[PDB]
Structures are given as structure tokens and as C-alpha cells.
Design a protein around this ligand. Sequence first.
Ligand SMILES: Cc1cc2nc3c(=O)[nH]c(=O)nc-3n(C[C@H](O)[C@H](O)[C@H](O)COP(=O)(O)OP(=O)(O)OC[C@H]3O[C@@H](n4cnc5c(N)ncnc54)[C@H](O)[C@@H]3O)c2cc1C
Ligand SMILES: O=C(O)c1[nH]c(O)c2c1c1c3ccccc3[nH]c1c1[nH]c3ccccc3c12
Length: 522
Amino acid sequence: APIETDVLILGGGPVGMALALDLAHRQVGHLVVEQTDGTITHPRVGTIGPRSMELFRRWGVAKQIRTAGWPGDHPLDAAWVTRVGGHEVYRIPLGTADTRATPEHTPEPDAICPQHWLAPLLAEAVGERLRTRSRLDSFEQRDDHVRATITDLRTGATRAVHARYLVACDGASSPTRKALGIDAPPRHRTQVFRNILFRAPELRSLLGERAALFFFLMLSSSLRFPLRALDGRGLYRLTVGVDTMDSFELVRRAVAFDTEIEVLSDSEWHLTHRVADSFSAGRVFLTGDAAHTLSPSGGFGMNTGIGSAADLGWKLAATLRGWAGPGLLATYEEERRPVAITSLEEANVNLRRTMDRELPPGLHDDGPRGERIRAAVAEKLERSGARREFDAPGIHFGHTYRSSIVCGEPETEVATGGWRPSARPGARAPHAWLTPTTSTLDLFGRGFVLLSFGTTDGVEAVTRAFADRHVPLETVTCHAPEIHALYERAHVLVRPDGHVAWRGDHLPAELGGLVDKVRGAA
Ligand SMILES: Cc1cc2nc3c(=O)[nH]c(=O)nc-3n(C[C@H](O)[C@H](O)[C@H](O)COP(=O)(O)OP(=O)(O)OC[C@H]3O[C@@H](n4cnc5c(N)ncnc54)[C@H](O)[C@@H]3O)c2cc1C
Ligand SMILES: O=C(O)c1[nH]c(O)c2c1c1c3ccccc3[nH]c1c1[nH]c3ccccc3c12
């Protein structure tokens, strides 16, 4: 008895679960298959970006993520040091969770949540629809659905699943991308690293006021990378480059204290810059790492994935419900790929900054002699814009879609200063508190939304144009002059994904035309 569902999600990692959460919130029947048993032994992701947090706010898991265990009094600072407990060279103070100032561009700042805490949270939200220890072996595309063979790794039995759509969130080495014959050429040189996970129970006490979330080491050529405090209560991770030495000894070399150290893992990995040439073929799609990979310098990886998952989510649901034009699905690649590429190049800039930084001779000496060399280095660090690696609002919220379903404005793209909120066509509708408890972002996520800051003339006609096409629409009349200034126009049409599709002080004459354009039937 072949099981059938609307969407088959290949991958139980961060990105596949987010996609499951989005389909769930859109009444789309779905099923997730994860080959592993779903537990985490070696945490990869630690920082949940703000944009991801906004989507989790909508899905109702943001709060549990923040109280998952990260200490509210632990420093979020990043610091360049010769060795942990050695000599400081440059620090970027970022407060603590309970201490930093409330952000103004968003309702959900970033959070610290190591993957072994995030997985249980996500599994519980996705619930019953997640199937662990299940591996997808192959898939055959038929006329109106995809047929896949799933091996139950528990009993050894194989079952078949017929779904209208097959979404592959199977990671960087996506077997699915290969079976379809799609190539994801490296845009930059591939590198190799080792990540050592360990427990150090008294390290925090010893560091006292010098405790940090990130310790960028400037010891040797292999040790010029971050040592991260994963859970703020004993767990740390040291990344080391490889162009042989014992695990424990590498950690001893990086940590200048005689304190208890317990090595747990020593995982080798490849940092790559690979984006797929195409994000789909037939009823089979690629999302997350299977579509785009980038250097972890900046922490953009999982966020760009969750972003693409949310994009595909509303477009899949629209085609399944019937109101989507035949050309809607193809905009997933049209819109997400360019974002993947630009985010990759920005991650590379951060990477090259520490790869090309030089480690002067007497950087380790004691006394004002070497202190002068450090002051020199710290100086160059400032000018190199190192802090851009730990403060990338533009990369988090500044991507603007320039596509066939977006009525873009003339204004081209040429950075002339730090990123600022914009309600321009293609961008993420900016945040503003309507009330102490409600954000403009809380109005988006379901169907199309039309914000009117002035006269509601024409709105009635907008409603009919959408109803005529069975396209879901919600009209909100807002007064707040502050929000009007931010959005700039009197009427703003926001897509189901929170991005602007059109804006103007006067609704257009051919509303049926606008409705057809924004739905992919242009
Ligand atoms: C050292 C390091 C640190 C990082 N830190 C961060 C960070 O702080 N923040 C951030 O945003 N990003 C971070 N990233 C990047 C981030 O980890 C990735 O972007 C993210 O994991 C991609 O998620 P994914 O769901 O697409 O795939 P993955 O997490 O790679 O998961 C793929 C899943 O597919 C499953 N699977 C594969 N094949 C099959 C099959 N045939 N059948 C069933 N299941 C299958 C796997 O078992 C796995 O669970 C980091 C990366 C590295 C290397
Ligand atoms: O995600 C990580 O913790 C992580 N793992 C890693 O291996 C990294 C990083 C991060 C990171 C996380 C949030 C904000 C900024 C960041 N820069 C780097 C970062 N920069 C690097 C440069 C070289 C090798 C590894 C990393 C690396």
C-alpha cells in the first residue's frame, strides 16, 4: 500500500524541518524522512540569525529557542587572542542576551542555540510527520507525481511514497542533485578543517571577565580560527585548518590554562562555495545546502536555507491549492539563486579577511615590547572591517528580488552606506511596532496582504480582483504616521512570504493584470 502525500521532504536537518513547519502552517500535507535517528552528537549550527528567528516567531517556536538553555548573562563578544587565556589583541563587545539593547530593525534578534538543543525543539514542533531512520534510495518522476523508494533503516524493509512534489534538503553532497545531473561548481577554492568538540568545566571561571562567545586565535597558520563557546556551560569547539597533531594537544595549545579538558569529537569537514546551476527539474526541487553552500564565516548557511525553504513553501502551497499561475514555481530559482550567490561572496569576503591577515613576528612577547606590536595589529584589524563578520544586517534582511513576479522600481543596486530598512518592491517588508506586542511582521505569512496608510479608495476593487482569481488577500488599514514614513507609499502589497510585490500611492488600472503578474501567470 504506497503512501501518498502532497510534499515529500528529503532531509530532517534544520532546513527540511523549517520547510515542514511552513507547509504545516499552510495546511499542506507533508512527510519528512531523516536517515539518522535524529539525535545530535556533534553540534554544527550555534547561531540562529534574526530573519530565521522572525520565521520561527511566526511558527511559534522562537520563545522555546531562546530559553533552551543559553545563559542570559554569558557574553556574546568576539575576540582576537594569541591563545585563550593568553594575550588579547582586539575585542568586539556585544553584551549578553539579557543585557544588549533592543534592536530597532526587527522584533526578533539573533539567538544562540547549539544544534543539540535546536533539533529536539524542531522535532517536537513538526511532530508525528517526521520519520527517522528512513533513507530515500531513488526516485522516478511520473506524470503528475514523484515515486520514491524509502528504506526503513530500522527493520530493513522498503516502502514506496508517491507525492506530488519531492523536495531535497539532503545537504551539501546532495545525491539528488547528482542524480538529476545538476552541477554546483565551486566559485572559490575548497578548504579543509577539523572541528574539536570538548568539555572544559572550569574554563568559564578562569576567564572571569574575559569570557567570550568567539575566540579568534592568532597562534599559527593552522590555528588562526575561532574557538567557540557552544552552550555557555562547559561545551566548546575549536576549528583548526589543515594544509596530524593529537586532538587534546591542539586544544592544549590553544587554551593557556591548566584546567580539565575532555575531547568529545574530532570532525573533519570541507568549507565550500558551491551553488547549483538549477534548483529544480520536474516535480523535484533542491533547497538548503543541496542547492547552496558557503563559508560559515558570518553564520549565513542555515539562514539562507531557511529563507529558501520559506520561499518554496508558499509557492508549493499556491500551486497545490490551484490559484498559482503555471510560472510560479520557476521563480524559486529566479529569486533564491541570486541571493545564494551574493551571500556566498559576502561570506568569502569575511573568510579572506582572516586568511590574508598577517601574523607579525613578536606577537606573543611579554612586556610593552610585544604590546606595541599587538596595538599595531589590533589597529589593522579595525580598518579591515572585521566586525562586519559579526554584524551583517544587510545580509540578513537586505536581499531584494528582481524578478518576473515583482514590479521592481528603477533604482539599481550600489551600496552607498550601511543597510537601512526599505519597503521597496522585492525586499522584506520592514519591521515596526503597531503596538508594544504586535509587529508589522505579525501581519504577514498567510496570504497576500495589502497595507493602506491613507485613503482606502480602490481597495474594494483590489479585493474583487483577488477573489476573481481565488488568490487569498487580507486588507489592513493603518494610521500610524511613523510606519507610513517607513513604507513611503500609501498602498503596499506584501506577498505570502513577507516580501513586497508592488507599491504606489495609486492602485493600478489593470488590477487583474497585477494579480496575474504577482501569482506567476504573467
Ligand atoms: C563548522 C560549521 C558551523 C556552522 N555554523 C552555522 C551557524 O551558526 N548558523 C548557520 O546559519 N549556519 C551554520 N553553518 C551552516 C549550516 O550548518 C548549514 O547551512 C545547514 O546545516 C544546512 O541545512 P540543511 O538542512 O540544508 O542540510 P544538513 O544540515 O546538511 O542536513 C541534511 C540532512 O539530510 C539527511 N539526509 C541526507 N541524505 C538522506 C537520505 N538519502 N535519506 C534520508 N535523509 C537523508 C541527513 O541525515 C541530514 O540530517 C555551519 C557549518 C559548519 C560546517
Ligand atoms: O557558525 C559558527 O559558529 C562557525 N563555525 C565556524 O567554523 C565559523 C563560524 C562563524 C560564525 C558564526 C556566527 C557569526 C559569525 C561567524 N563567523 C564564523 C567563522 N569564520 C571562520 C573563518 C575560518 C574558519 C571557520 C570560521 C567560522
